[PDB]
Symmetry: none
Subunit: 290 residues, 2 copies
Amino acid sequence: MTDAATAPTSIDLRAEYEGSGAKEVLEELDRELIGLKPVKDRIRETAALLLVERARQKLGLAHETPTLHMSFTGNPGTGKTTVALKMAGLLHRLGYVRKGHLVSVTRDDLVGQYIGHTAPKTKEVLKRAMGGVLFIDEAYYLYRPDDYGQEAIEILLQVMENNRDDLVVILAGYADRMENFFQSNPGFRSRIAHHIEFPDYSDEELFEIAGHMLDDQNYQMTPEAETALRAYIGLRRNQPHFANARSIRNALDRARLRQANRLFTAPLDARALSTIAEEDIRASRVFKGG
Amino acid sequence: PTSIDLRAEYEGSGAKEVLEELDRELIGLKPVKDRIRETAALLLVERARQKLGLTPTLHMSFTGNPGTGKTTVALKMAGLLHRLGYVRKGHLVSVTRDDLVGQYIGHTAPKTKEVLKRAMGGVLFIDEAYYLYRPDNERDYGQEAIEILLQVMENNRDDLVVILAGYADRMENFFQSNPGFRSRIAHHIEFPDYSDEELFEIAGHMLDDQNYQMTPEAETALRAYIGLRRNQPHFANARSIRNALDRARLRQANRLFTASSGPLDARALSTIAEEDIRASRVFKGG
């Protein structure tokens, strides 16, 4: 009876990081996410673990696969899906998951209407998702004890413990709703390896964004419109279902529509056409509360 | 040219003539019609801006229930867009998911592409577009149609406008799963239902056209009915009304046949009673 190890004695982490194409994925994430340090930094921290646990496996110290599903909580427009894209990428380059693909999904894709229809629907989605990552947006809507989503949850749960080298799940949505979900459904908390919290952009950053949005479309703002917009951002951001940069485009979109109707209703040069007056923003229902 | 008269373009385009055409050809849904009036204004201004040196961005989404004017507004849009020089041949190509995705493995990309060829110079109108994304099904090749669609909406711009339409809950989910559409749709138009009073007017006209009258009690019974029906799934406005009246008529016929006091006259046979409407499972909960 003998026992011999046939695994490298040492491993350079920086060498693996670089050569596994792991480094680059994080760099892509840098390019593909308009400055959101806290989350980018959080992902790096996650990436160091994935890299170490890979290194441990290569030295022959691994016992099972690490648990490596995760939960992205936050407001819309905060970078979740595009991070999940990168998470799929990084997990692929680190050989944690077979094929680097992401399968984005919502309640409807898993929960059928007529009785019995749920089980094969989830399973089929799961099949397409094996090899890569399954991203379930607002996963908490599966559980509505108010529709047999209960079964999707169970097939989902079973899968998450059992066969780990096939699939990775990233649950996503608002934090409070996700927390209640976890409260109402034990067993997920055990399985989730990582909670990544996605914060909003600052008033300053959203104003930056709005600024660029206008410039591209050659649109100038009056100072009273600059005031109004700032006010707007401040109010909108504490109102339900805040969609960061998206709800800024929508707001500017709505201001662009009002501005167009204002003029047309009242000959005009390029300045009069490209200018957005205070009324166009102030006319929003964000100021009246709604 | 240095300034631009907007009314000159508005009157020169015939854009007003299409907006009139919309009022005349859509039983009053002033809410929507104003939203289209407003979009017309912006479309006008944007054009006047493009004519002073400042590619547009045109695609839109139409969300709401069956029977809110999505198709008949989309047709007028194609008109309006052709009148404001955004589109070359102002014609609307209306398609479902079953016109873009083929069963066979690879017989989808030529099919989407050819449909698109027919769409060029006008508007493609994808009804219930979210049905292109079916990862629920295996052997449905709808993701390729999405890819080709998405690529077209960014790249090959100045010769096509796309309108995705259908239920809003299902559309917003479709954007979650397939992002890059939100940024490509510049116009989100919500199509709300008819107001209760309007639905009731419709019900009334339908019954006049058929020579049936309601008893006052039954009228209030319908008003109750309508309010409930609009909160249940798949409300189809006018269709749901025809459907209720059809079932009411069926119930009225059976009420009368089963009573059989003896002979009965035109009023008895033309009247829909409270029983005929209230017997609906819409009042039970479904």
